[PDB]
Design an enzyme around this catalytic site. Structure first.
Site, PDB file in Angstrom:
ATOM      1  CD  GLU A 210      -3.072   0.807  -0.206  1.00 30.16           C
ATOM      2  OE1 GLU A 210      -3.856   0.372  -1.080  1.00 30.16           O
ATOM      3  OE2 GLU A 210      -2.781   2.021  -0.088  1.00 30.16           O
ATOM      4  CG  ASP A 219      -9.152   8.878   0.518  1.00 30.08           C
ATOM      5  OD1 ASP A 219      -9.672   9.948   0.125  1.00 30.08           O
ATOM      6  OD2 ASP A 219      -9.771   8.030   1.197  1.00 30.08           O
TER       7      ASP A 219
HETATM    8  C1  OLA Z   1     -16.024  -0.657   5.696  1.00 25.41           C
HETATM    9  C2  OLA Z   1     -14.806  -1.547   5.762  1.00 25.41           C
HETATM   10  C3  OLA Z   1     -13.975  -1.553   4.503  1.00 25.41           C
HETATM   11  C4  OLA Z   1     -12.487  -1.726   4.714  1.00 25.41           C
HETATM   12  C5  OLA Z   1     -11.660  -0.517   4.344  1.00 25.41           C
HETATM   13  C6  OLA Z   1     -10.906  -0.649   3.041  1.00 25.41           C
HETATM   14  C7  OLA Z   1     -11.289   0.371   1.979  1.00 25.41           C
HETATM   15  C8  OLA Z   1     -10.644   0.136   0.648  1.00 25.41           C
HETATM   16  C9  OLA Z   1     -10.178   1.381  -0.050  1.00 25.41           C
HETATM   17  C10 OLA Z   1      -9.173   2.175   0.259  1.00 25.41           C
HETATM   18  C11 OLA Z   1      -7.722   1.826   0.395  1.00 25.41           C
HETATM   19  C12 OLA Z   1      -7.049   2.579   1.505  1.00 25.41           C
HETATM   20  C13 OLA Z   1      -5.696   2.032   1.951  1.00 25.41           C
HETATM   21  C14 OLA Z   1      -5.746   0.967   3.032  1.00 25.41           C
HETATM   22  C15 OLA Z   1      -5.957   1.478   4.444  1.00 25.41           C
HETATM   23  C16 OLA Z   1      -7.396   1.391   4.928  1.00 25.41           C
HETATM   24  C17 OLA Z   1      -7.526   1.551   6.411  1.00 25.41           C
HETATM   25  C18 OLA Z   1      -8.881   1.140   6.963  1.00 25.41           C
HETATM   26  O1  OLA Z   1      -9.887   1.784   6.593  1.00 25.41           O
HETATM   27  O2  OLA Z   1      -8.933   0.176   7.759  1.00 25.41           O
END
Ligand code: OLA
Ligand code: QK8
Ligand code: OLA
Ligand code: OLA
Ligand code: OLA
Ligand code: OLA
Ligand code: OLA
Ligand code: OLA
Ligand code: OLA
Ligand code: OLA
Ligand code: OLA
Ligand code: OLA
Length: 446
Positions: A210, A219
């Site tokens: 990531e 983002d």
């Molecule tokens: C509602 C739960 C969904 C899980 C979150 C993932 C969303 C996917 C899209 C974005 C990527 C962002 C980079 C990764 C870190 C996410 C952190 C988090 O939200 O737990």
């Protein structure tokens, strides 16, 4: 006792007291004078330093007068009150080590749900109750045992706890003040270490896949983020993002953070994701089936695609819980996910295939100052309190086996724990070592 022996014991015991008083004062003042040290776990370090300052200033010097004079000349009341101060402070030190260990245990295992309970107010609560339980445990039985028995059997010129006269009772107190606390803290540490290396591996995996940003960024949706995708705010203000960051970190960050502050934020996120997985009926059976390495590969997928996205892979999820990894790898590769991020998808799929970290190249767990300090103070307690507890152990199997000289030396070693505790913080923690140095140099000047 010879006058040559009187001056020698006084000098050595006196310098030991001086080294114990200075060290615990440096520890207390470092936390007071330095903002970076003003953390919840250091409230317990300060509480432990207070117990060790009483041992250094009072207990040690009163024990010296007792050894040098060859008898107790201050009376029975002065005796019973001094024994109460000595045992209550020694027990408060053991109870403070238990508070340090448990706090460190929950802050690593449950970072999200515990760092909502982890306030300085709750630290102060646990500290006070530890000192109160310590007092209520020793002081009433020290002062009133003679009244329940109907006789004071401790002779005049002698000072010791009357109820501890029988070795099994003393062994019972050793089980409660040494053996059980030590077993509890060693078990707590092995869990803390295992969790730390597990969580570090997920952090380095997502750092490669990531990417880690130490400065506030936007983002895909245009929301202010930091670290490994930690959403700060949905608000379209950079100052709102900076304020939400300072509230999460506990300092004026100005939009920039360290890797460790970004790791602490990431570990709350791993907890949020793991909560989701266990609440989702399609991901819960597969996650429970998987090992620590394959669990991280599933967490990686959740961080990238979301909860429902990963839940969409019905047949791959079934093969993964059936331990048919070669087959699960085929279905995962034939997706829009692999087409968009081939390098990242291959690495995750290989992790599911091999069950190792071979797709990445991981370093050994970087042992942070907190983990190292905990291990050091635990080993400091085990080292200095073992001789006395072995003496207690052997006294139960043999009546008056243990010589008076050995009881005397084992008691001194218990006291040495108060001297070596501030040294453990100075050896393991850079901020403590530099503040100790700063304070000593400042005192030398003027
Ligand atoms: C509602 C739960 C969904 C899980 C979150 C993932 C969303 C996917 C899209 C974005 C990527 C962002 C980079 C990764 C870190 C996410 C952190 C988090 O939200 O737990
Ligand atoms: C956890 C509770 O604590 C213990 O289980 N402990 C184990 C070792 C013995 C130790 N001390 C050492 C000094 C002794 C002494 O004669 N003290 C005076 C000079 C007379 C009153 C003051 C009394 C016993 C206390 C700590
Ligand atoms: C007579 C007063 C003595 C009291 C001093 C206070 C106690 C703390 C000092 C001891 C720790 C030693 C510091 C050296 C750090 C070395 C770091 C390392 O190499 O790991
Ligand atoms: C912070 C905890 C309190 C520290 C106070 C330290 C005082 C205890 C030290 C012991 C020495 C004083 C005892 C005097 C005994 C000699 C009198 C006599 O000969 O009868
Ligand atoms: C919610 C649990 C209740 C904790 C009460 C602690 C009593 C005070 C004595 C301290 C040492 C005992 C062991 C440490 C337990 C602390 C665990 C916690 O943080 O809740
Ligand atoms: C670490 C625990 C070990 C300490 C041992 C003490 C156990 C607790 C029991 C003590 C009983 C004595 C209580 C005193 C009662 C006071 C009676 C009175 O009013 O005179
Ligand atoms: C940290 C693990 C250490 C292992 C413990 C075994 C070592 C025992 C320690 C030494 C001090 C005990 C002294 C015993 C004296 C009693 C014997 C006698 O009757 O003279
Ligand atoms: C903590 C650093 C201090 C330096 C270590 C030296 C002091 C400890 C030793 C002295 C106690 C005497 C032990 C020898 C047994 C003598 C027997 C007896 O008194 O009958
Ligand atoms: C300025 C203080 C000097 C330091 C003290 C010397 C410590 C050396 C280490 C060994 C322990 C000495 C114990 C003496 C035993 C004598 C036996 C006796 O007659 O009681
Ligand atoms: C010889 C084995 C060494 C054991 C280490 C004991 C810890 C010593 C530390 C403190 C110094 C106190 C001075 C000694 C008091 C004299 C007691 C006596 O031997 O009668
Ligand atoms: C950020 C600042 C840190 C504040 C932490 C406060 C923790 C509380 C400390 C412990 C106090 C325990 C009571 C000690 C009794 C001493 C009495 C005596 O002098 O005999
Ligand atoms: C918590 C506050 C404590 C205040 C300090 C009090 C100091 C104690 C003073 C000495 C009284 C001594 C009692 C006399 C008993 C004689 C018995 C005997 O010698 O066998």
């Amino acid at each position: 006792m010879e006058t040559v022996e009187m001056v020698a014991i006084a000098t050595v015991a006196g310098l030991l007291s001086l080294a114990t008083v200075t060290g615990n004062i440096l520890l207390m003042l470092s936390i007071k004078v330095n903002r970076q040290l003003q953390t919840v776990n250091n409230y317990f370090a300060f509480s432990l330093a207070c117990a060790d300052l009483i041992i250094g200033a009072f207990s040690m010097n009163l024990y010296t007068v007792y050894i040098i004079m060859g008898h107790w000349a201050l009376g029975a009341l002065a005796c019973d009150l001094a024994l109460a101060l000595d045992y209550v402070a020694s027990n408060a030190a053991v109870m403070n080590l238990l508070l340090i260990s448990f706090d460190r245990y929950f802050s690593v295992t449950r970072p999200l749900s515990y760092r909502a309970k982890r306030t300085p107010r709750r630290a102060l609560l646990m500290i006070g109750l530890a000192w109160l339980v310590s007092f209520v445990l020793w002081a009433p039985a020290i002062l009133f045992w003679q009244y329940l028995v109907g006789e004071r059997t401790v002779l005049a010129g002698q000072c010791y706890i009357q109820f501890l006269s029988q070795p099994i009772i003393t062994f019972g107190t050793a089980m409660a003040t040494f053996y059980l606390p030590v077993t509890v803290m060693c078990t707590l540490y092995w869990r803390i270490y295992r969790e730390t290396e597990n969580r570090a591996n997920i952090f380095e995996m997502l750092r490669i896949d990531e990417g880690l940003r130490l400065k506030i960024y936007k983002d895909t949706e245009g929301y202010y983020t930091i670290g490994i995708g930690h959403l700060l705010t949905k608000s379209p203000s950079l100052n709102a993002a900076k304020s939400e960051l300072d509230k999460a970190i506990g300092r004026n960050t100005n939009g920039v953070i360290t890797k460790d502050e970004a790791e602490k934020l990431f570990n709350q996120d791993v907890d949020a994701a793991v909560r989701g997985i266990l609440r989702n009926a399609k991901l819960k059976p597969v996650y429970d089936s998987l090992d620590a390495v394959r669990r991280a590969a599933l967490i990686n997928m959740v961080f990238q695609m979301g909860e429902t996205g990963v839940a969409g892979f019905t047949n791959s999820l079934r093969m993964l819980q059936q331990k048919r990894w070669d087959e699960a790898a085929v279905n995962l590769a034939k997706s829009r996910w692999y087409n968009q991020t081939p390098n990242r998808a291959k690495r995750v799929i290989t992790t599911f295939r091999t069950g190792t970290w071979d797709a990445y190249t991981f370093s050994l767990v970087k042992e942070k100052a907190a983990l190292r300090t905990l291990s050091a103070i635990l080993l400091a307690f085990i080292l200095t309190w073992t001789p006395y507890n072995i003496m207690v152990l052997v006294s139960t199997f043999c009546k008056d086996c243990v010589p008076e000289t050995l009881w005397e030396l084992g008691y001194w070693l218990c006291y040495v724990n108060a001297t070596i505790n501030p040294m453990c913080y100075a050896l393991c923690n850079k901020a403590f070592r530099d503040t100790f140095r700063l304070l000593l140099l400042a005192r030398w000047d003027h």
